[PDB]
Design a protein around this ligand. Structure first.
Ligand code: HDD
Ligand code: HDD
Ligand code: HDD
Ligand SMILES: [Ca+2]
Ligand SMILES: [Ca+2]
Ligand SMILES: [Ca+2]
Ligand SMILES: [Ca+2]
Lengths: 671, 318, 673
């Protein structure tokens, strides 16, 4: 897709950037033990390049990973939008997607608790179109002008830069409790949505209401939903923390591997479509980015398939340099007066000047469109074009009036939806329609399963216990209590404060479908999921058992790692490097029982710790071949615990457990 | 210490950068449910500043933390050096020190297995003098031209940028095994020196031989050693790994806390000193950065005391 | 040539930079008379681009112009150099050249008195090779570390940024008089070489001694000389001043026009070649950039032909963005220990970071080589490549040891001349071999014609009289006196001080060939030269005469401008826009005599002024038709003057006039001391 820009260095002699053959291994010196010479241009060109390798990280979403793919339209959608990439059944458009966390710098861990980015570029035949989304459908704040306040509060305290990649500190919770618009996104982030199992096991949302615009000028209001076809799954917190140390690259590695193995992740690209007249019809304002439209009020329409199936060739050139903009819009789509969206349009154009160091960022290969460019933009640092038109102004005669103006009736121009209107004073005021900050947080909470609700309370217990300021903690309880008294009681208990009296203004009992993770049934596929087989080199029977388990499991598309004390044929990984965070299920082979009862080859207790960690974290665990299960204190009658002599019976059971994915009965509930 | 540059915001009304009082909580709109206006300079100034907050991270040692303090000379060292900050018993010079890992990007864990930086600025009365050192006294390579090869090999593989803050992948060990000069530092990094218990519990080394030069022009060869007064200590690997997840900020927090509690760490600033004529007298070349002078051949002279006792006010600025 | 990177906009609809069709003529507003909306991305992308169009001008040589061309080798030069672009008879290499002034900013005048740049890139089959030269063969200073001192003193005073593009102020002459190394270049800049007729009528020099290195490792020392095939010519100062106002773009227009008309300028690319053992054999040190080798000691070898024949498509992309380096060197060439050259090597790599704003400047189309690049340079802002090699370190096995090291013995690597050696203390000290600052300035002066010497004295008189400090002026006279007592006396007369007593330590009578302008005989071609024909619409006979002359003159490749009161068929420009600075020769058709004797159509006395200026500036001037006395008498021009023509016969007039155009300037019209 970017083949034209590729450079091959599999053969040939080293050259400078200007094609002069050189060496790069020894400096030029005055004598064999002498000082280095200023005239060594080989040294200086190489080291100057290295000195200047780094560019500023993204202001937010700095930690991320990307991949190429294809979007395929399901239909001709001309009846709802003029968008060209949606105008025919089976029409294909190349994409590039970057997934991310939100708060952390480059290098921070994939499995921090955070909002996640899900930014998609469609290189359409009518221009690049970006949907710059998250895995959570609502955002913290209601006006773009507050973005630096939110981000300052959530990022590390600026005297010492602590803590990394975490909301678990005074300033984040000060802001949350003073700015109650944050409640809805906060509840999402404190749920399993804050710690997804992978990029592939989360959805993407545009968050804002946008407009679909037909060629006849008429418009409808829409929300984007990218619905995962791998299913939705999360980690548990105590697992995620360990994972962040053991493998900070977990999500980017999971994505890379899935693509390399021919299991590229897919999403159905969907919209809710409603009329302009329904802006205020659902009990809230569609301009308000802290609100969802319950699917009960407006069902999803599947527009097409998004698949990622190609890894990048150079991370920096493609992933690090990809510069998304919501200003990258195409005919058939329009903005709304969402004050959060409104300000994003300014931000993403400006910020690329920082990242790129100059105004020609759209000329980077990953940013280039796949159609011709005709405009009178000129010059600027790093200018890569040589423009033939020496009269780049409009109106002109000396270039015969080209380029020609494009608009609703000519050249397939972008046009602002013509029904759009403005009225009233020029105000810095918030619409009173935005004022309910608590009902939908309560809607969300209500829609989670009992143990899901416990996880969310426990995440808040975890974070809020780390907040030093008593007054901040009290202010947080005041807000939580406006969402749910029971939530406020249960988190207050962990922090040795009393919950404030129930305040039932925004309490209710309503639920909405599609927001629960643990409630969303078994995973629709178990391909790519990781099984660790714990074995030993001290018994040949153990290795035979492991090999036979491997053959049967790999048939079904599972990634199998055989662990033992040392590497050899048939063994993938040593107990020294193995951890339960690296597996979705763990199997012990009968023949290795002795290991679970000291060695210079791995830390004491490592084999049983893997098995016990996995069990306590809710994973399917089993022995194939009661001795092991006793030592682990794992009950043989447990859901998601497996115990079988026959490899075929074991696998058939165990694969059911992998689809269930987490056995939530293993977690204690309040009162 | 940088008091003259400090900005106080404990009182007052919000202004622009040009001192005009403003607000910054709601955008200017055409009507209460209307589009945001281009003429909203309040919005744009604040968001432009935000869009441009970040700068490139350091090419190496991107992850680190710093503190202010003071160096105090134990003697008049004119007998061995003209250096002014060493020219009197009790003479004090302000310092700033940054510690770091080496491979990881700026949000990576403190407790990765790595070489560590230990960079010291002396704001002397004859100019700023930096000693840009590490916690390990030898380096991987013998010629600066090879620096990008080393760093490319140790940093994440460049198709997928995996793995973060780690030499535990094919490329790093391919380089080590093809470039045997690396052996000495590698052994240090694979020992406990790769996972120190804190910045306070490691030493600092200049690594290179430098020269001490008297006012009469005579010179002697030196190595810098900053010797910890807190003792030397390390983690165990299996603890380090868990720590990297539980608290990525462990080292910076440890340092901040020690300073805030009045326990600011201390080093003895020492040199080995030998004659120009001894450059090859020890069975190796003193120009070779992959070698130490065993202490049996040349003892440490303690020049003075380095104490860190003041945390920064703004991490980014400082 | 750079065709791969060209963008065509001769058809199609306006798009954003990401290919989405848009408009760009009206802002999106809340109502027909309302405020502009932030969501107007069409506005913002267009204006952001405009806001960021400019880049820093070059720190020096900011004012210049460029063209593409070809170099053709005359031989296989393997006998003296391994350089691949010189390795076969008839071998052709694409080139790009930028010419420039030195002190002035962007937008300053082409015809300031200055050193001029002449920078040539050869896009060779073994890498880009730049020769970054000037039109003057020696430089002001002997150590690169002094460059910012020179440049600060010569550029405008830093409190008010006055004066532009001029050494005519105190600080410049303060530096010149305190740093006598400057004398040689100063004398050059004060001659006609400081105000060349055009980029095409000046030479190029590398200035430094370099080395030619053979594949066997032996080396010789060389100087580069690019010798104009158009001939050498200069303006006069009083002409250049007016030209700087009337047409700041004169040299860039001259060059553009010559190329468009199929008259692209040519140089012979030459070297002086001497042995390593002759470094100090010629009475000075070849490491010293303030010295020439007189060609009596070392004659030129002609290596090949440089021709410029294609103008750029986009000035900013090609000319503004071209980033030369002396560090752009190829196998077969090496550096010397010229302490000026030595420092340049650092400067030109570093300064591109400032101009480009990032490290990938070699990826700009005008900077790219015409051969494959194989190296482990990665990332950086503006990275345009997508590298397939995921193991960019050496040594590696994971990319099979590629790229491979190139050196003397493998892969045609660059290598330092292996005879090269160093010895002694590490010193910040100047070689005593550098200490004669005066003898060669005297040699240069001696080699000019009498009138030429007068012109130089007069440039010095002009500039030094604008120096306000009495002490600086005295200090200047001191240094001048060490070169030539007569020069000191004559310059001193203009400024009202006494010259110091003669000091003969460095006086001599030696001369050297090929440095004089006025002495270098008639031009070898008059093609492209400009002839203004002053006519009138008041007489239909005047235009008939102008037309006959035009036909006769254009046949010989002159650029003919017919001037009258108003435009019409046959008339190219009005008296209102016409000026003597626009012409190399001026002809009056005798049918227009009455104009030389008021109109709302041009400033009072304009027609006569054009003729008078032309004469006084030394140009061939004439009246064609047979009646000359009314024009000549009004101009105070004597009919019997050299370079004054008066014929009835058009044919006879043109034959005579064209010899005058080759003579170029008639120097008998200038007074001597
Ligand atoms: C006015 C400021 C502004 C506000 C209100 C938003 N953001 Fe943003 N966002 C930025 C300003 C910003 C930015 C600072 O401009 C970034 C950082 C780097 C960049 O290219 O844009 C960005 C980064 C960016 C990324 C990373 C893109 C990539 O992978 O390269 C994603 C996925 C989002 N954001 C998504 C959102 C969503 C779904 C929001 C709420 C609806 C949102 N942002 C609010
Ligand atoms: C020629 C390239 C190269 C070589 C051979 C060295 N490094 Fe370096 N070092 C750099 C290139 C450099 C750099 C890229 O220039 C850095 C990155 C950020 C900076 O300001 O300088 C730097 C960063 C830097 C830092 C961080 C300073 C701070 O905290 O801001 C320390 C402690 C060191 N290095 C220490 C050394 C040691 C002890 C070396 C071996 C003796 C060494 N470096 C070799
Ligand atoms: C060490 C500083 C310094 C020294 C001693 C020199 N210059 Fe230089 N020169 C530069 C610093 C440099 C520079 C600042 O690096 C420039 C400005 C922009 C650029 O690309 O390089 C440059 C510009 C440059 C240009 C314009 C190139 C172009 O057209 O883009 C020419 C022709 C020269 N110089 C030629 C010379 C000659 C013939 C020298 C004496 C032998 C010389 N320079 C000494
Ligand atoms: Ca805080
Ligand atoms: Ca690797
Ligand atoms: Ca001055
Ligand atoms: Ca910049």
């Amino acid at each position: 897709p970017l083949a034209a820009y590729e450079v091959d260095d599999s053969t040939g002699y080293l050259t400078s950037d200007v094609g002069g053959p050189i060496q790069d291994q020894t400096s030029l010196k005055a004598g064999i033990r002498g000082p280095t010479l200023l005239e060594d241009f080989m040294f200086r060109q190489k080291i100057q390049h290295f000195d200047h390798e780094r560019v500023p990280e993204r202001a937010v979403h700095a930690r991320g990973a990307g991949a190429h793919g294809t979007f395929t339209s399901y239909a001709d959608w001309s009846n709802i939008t003029a968008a060209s990439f949606l105008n025919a059944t089976g029409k294909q458009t190349p994409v590039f997607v970057r997934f991310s966390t939100f708060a952390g710098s480059r290098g921070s861990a994939d499995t921090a608790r955070d909002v996640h980015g899900f930014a998609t570029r469609f290189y359409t035949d009518e221009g690049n179109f970006d949907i710059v989304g998250n895995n959570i459908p609502v955002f913290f704040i209601q006006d773009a002008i507050q973005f630096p306040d939110l981000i300052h509060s959530v990022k590390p305290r600026p005297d010492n830069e602590i803590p990394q990649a975490a909301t678990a500190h005074d300033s984040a919770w000060d802001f949350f409790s003073q700015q109650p618009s944050t409640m809805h996104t906060l509840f999402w982030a404190m749920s399993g949505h804050g710690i997804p199992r992978s990029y592939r096991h989360m959805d993407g949302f545009g968050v804002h209401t946008f407009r679909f615009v037909k060629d006849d000028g008429s418009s409808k209001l829409i929300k984007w939903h990218f619905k995962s076809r791998q299913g939705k799954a999360s980690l548990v917190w105590e697992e995620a923390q360990v994972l962040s140390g053991k493998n900070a690259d977990f999500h980017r590695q999971d994505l890379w591997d899935a693509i390399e193995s021919g299991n590229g992740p897919e999403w159905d690209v969907c919209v809710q479509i409603v009329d302009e007249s329904q802006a205020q019809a659902f009990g809230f304002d569609l301009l308000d980015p802290t609100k969802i439209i319950p699917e009960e009020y407006a069902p999803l329409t599947k527009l097409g398939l998004l698949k990622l199936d190609r890894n990048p060739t150079n991370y920096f050139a493609e992933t690090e340099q990809v510069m998304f903009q919501p200003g990258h819009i195409v005919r058939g789509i329009d903005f709304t007066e969402d004050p959060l969206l409104q300000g994003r349009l300014f931000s993403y154009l400006d910020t690329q000047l920082n990242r790129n160091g100059g105004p020609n960022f759209e000329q980077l290969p990953i940013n280039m469109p796949r159609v011709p460019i005709h405009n009178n933009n000129r010059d600027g640092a790093g200018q890569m074009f040589i423009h033939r038109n020496k009269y780049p102004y409009t109106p002109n005669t000396l270039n015969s009036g080209y380029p020609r103006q494009a608009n609703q009736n000519a050249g397939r121009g972008f046009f602002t939806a013509p029904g759009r209107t403005a009225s009233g004073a020029l105000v810095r005021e918030v619409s009173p329609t935005f004022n309910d900050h608590w009902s939908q947080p309560r809607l969300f909470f209500n829609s989670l399963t009992p143990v899901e609700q416990q996880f969310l309370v426990n995440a808040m217990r975890f974070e809020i216990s780390l907040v030093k300021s008593e007054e901040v903690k009290k202010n947080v309880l005041t807000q939580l209590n406006r969402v749910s008294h029971d939530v406020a009681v249960r988190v207050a208990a962990a922090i040795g404060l009393g919950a404030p009296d129930a305040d039932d203004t925004y309490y209710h009992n309503n639920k909405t479908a599609g927001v629960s993770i643990v409630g969303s049934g078994p995973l629709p596929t178990i391909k790519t999921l990781r099984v660790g087989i714990l074995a030993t080199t001290s018994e040949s029977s153990a290795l035979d058992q492991a090999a036979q388990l491997r053959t049967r499991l790999e048939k079904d598309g599972l990634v199998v790692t055989v662990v033992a004390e040392t590497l050899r044929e048939g063994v993938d990984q040593t107990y020294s490097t193995a951890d339960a965070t690296g597996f979705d299920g763990v199997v012990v082979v009968d023949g290795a029982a002795a290991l679970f009862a000291s060695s210079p080859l791995f830390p004491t207790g490592r084999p049983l710790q893997i098995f016990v960690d996995a069990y306590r974290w809710g994973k399917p665990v089993g022995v194939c071949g009661s001795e092991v299960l006793d030592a682990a204190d794992v009950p043989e009658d447990g859901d998601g615990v497996y115990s079988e002599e026959s490899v075929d019976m074991f696998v058939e059971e165990f694969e059911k457990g992998l689809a269930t994915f987490r056995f939530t009965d293993r977690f204690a509930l309040d009162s």
